[PDB]
Design a protein around this ligand. Structure first.
Ligand code: NA
Ligand code: NA
Ligand code: NA
Ligand code: NA
Ligand code: NA
Length: 444
């Protein structure tokens, strides 16, 4: 009688640096993204998150907005530089914000899902080597342990890392994200130190045995299609699939890095960080997997260089990111996890959404019908996965509101709520009205 059960969680998501603002208030010190956005050329028009959506000051209005929409769960991240603005120096005023935020959520019947690390590493940590320094495993563990102990009465659903592929390869190999290095060997070691840190938090979390509390991790995943049936393109797709998906899924859920990728990367950089002890910590059992899904890739063999597959344009509709709108890969990825990695474990879609060219018209509305149809198509695939026996527990739309889209600055708008940054006014888009109806009727 219901496409989505009463226990299914309809959510929305944000991240701390993308929405909070108040970047220098109540003891917060700089993160790598404050520093990165101030480096010439790194972020669109030198945008930064000094103010962003001012959610730090406006959080009560934003929670009321979610309650009036009927939101059942809210995924947010916690800013490490607010909690430990210097090494080993705990900041109670930083903790106090997340206590008043989650108190407000709970009092309006919204379930909090807290991301421990969503890319805003403290600058003091990077100055000591950051994710390249194995001692970060201990610093991250101390940070996570403090959150568990202070917020365990408020938060019962924890996500250790958001998209470690971005924090490693996009940040240290491609160089688009903070701190912006371009060195394959560094990206590979960072990938390992991130997973090891995830492992340490899981170890601490299990040792606390918190009542009715769950921990997971969030991965951005895609589906890779070969451009043709040639053997050349088949190998190209295999490498691209290992690069985005299996390099993280395999150590987490099989206790082993994918061997074809270890041998491939080893022709170009050192892979000697791999050892049995570390992979045991990395592959500790989780309560759920969070999936960030946006698009697929169609790839053709390049000129045998390092990760040089040619991106094929198959000629279908795309978002303002240039990302193909291909909702069937949401179902395909969820099913692949069910059959190859996670089996019967609970899954959440922790991000799905789209950037379009939103404008407020003379009637004061944002008629974002392309976003309405995008979300409708993807929620129909979630419904199909559920009807085929998949263990999907909830779905968080990226994002609650327009926000700071990293190297794109404010130029890409992902919200179901429009933000006029000059006034910080919130305007419900037509997609938010559609989502409100979906939550109320649980019908699609
Ligand atoms: Na911010
Ligand atoms: Na800037
Ligand atoms: Na697991
Ligand atoms: Na769970
Ligand atoms: Na499709």
């Amino acid at each position: 009688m219901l496409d989505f059960s009463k226990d299914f969680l309809f959510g929305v998501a944000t991240a701390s640096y993308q929405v909070e603002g108040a970047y220098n208030e109540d003891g917060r010190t700089m993160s790598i993204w404050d520093t990165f956005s101030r480096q010439d050329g790194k972020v669109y028009k030198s945008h930064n998150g000094d103010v962003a959506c001012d959610h730090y000051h406006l959080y009560k209005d934003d929670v009321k907005m979610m309650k009036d929409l009927g939101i059942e769960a809210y995924r947010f991240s916690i800013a490490w530089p607010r909690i430990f603005p210097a090494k080993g120096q705990y900041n109670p005023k930083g903790m106090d914000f997340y206590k008043r935020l989650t108190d407000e959520l709970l009092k309006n019947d919204i379930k909090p899902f807290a991301t421990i690390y969503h890319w805003d590493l403290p600058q003091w940590a990077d100055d000591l080597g950051g994710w390249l320094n194995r001692e970060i495993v201990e610093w991250y563990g101390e940070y996570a342990e403090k959150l568990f102990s202070e917020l365990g009465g408020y938060i019962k659903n924890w996500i250790t890392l958001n998209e470690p592929w971005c924090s490693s390869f996009l940040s240290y190999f491609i160089g688009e994200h903070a701190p912006g290095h371009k060195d394959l060997g560094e990206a590979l070691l960072v990938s390992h130190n991130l997973l090891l840190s995830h492992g340490k938090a899981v170890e601490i979390f299990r040792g606390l045995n918190l009542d009715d509390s769950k921990i997971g991790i969030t991965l951005n995943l895609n589906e890779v299609f070969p451009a043709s049936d040639s053997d050349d393109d088949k190998v190209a797709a295999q490498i691209a699939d290992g690069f985005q998906n299996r390099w993280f899924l395999d150590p987490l859920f099989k206790g082993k890095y994918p061997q074809d990728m270890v041998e491939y990367f080893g022709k170009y950089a050192k892979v000697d960080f791999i050892n049995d002890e570390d992979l045991k910590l990395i592959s500790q059992k989780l309560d759920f997997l969070g999936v960030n899904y946006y698009t697929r890739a169609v790839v053709q063999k390049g000129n045998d260089g390092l990760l040089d597959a040619v991106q094929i344009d198959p000629g279908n509709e795309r978002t303002e990111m240039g990302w193909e709108i291909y909702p069937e890969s949401l179902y395909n990825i969820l099913m692949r996890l069910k059959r190859e990695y996670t089996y019967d474990m609970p899954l959440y879609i922790t991000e799905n959404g789209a950037a379009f060219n939103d404008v407020v018209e003379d009637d004061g509305r944002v008629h974002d019908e392309k976003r309405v149809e995008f979300l409708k198509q993807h929620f129909k695939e979630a419904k199909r996965f559920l009807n085929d026996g998949g263990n999907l527990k909830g779905y968080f739309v990226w994002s609650l509101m327009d926000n700071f889209e990293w190297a794109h600055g404010y130029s890409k708008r992902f919200g179901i709520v429009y933000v006029d940054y000059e006034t910080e006014k919130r305007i419900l888009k037509d997609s938010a009205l559609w989502y409100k109806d979906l939550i109320s009727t649980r019908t699609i």
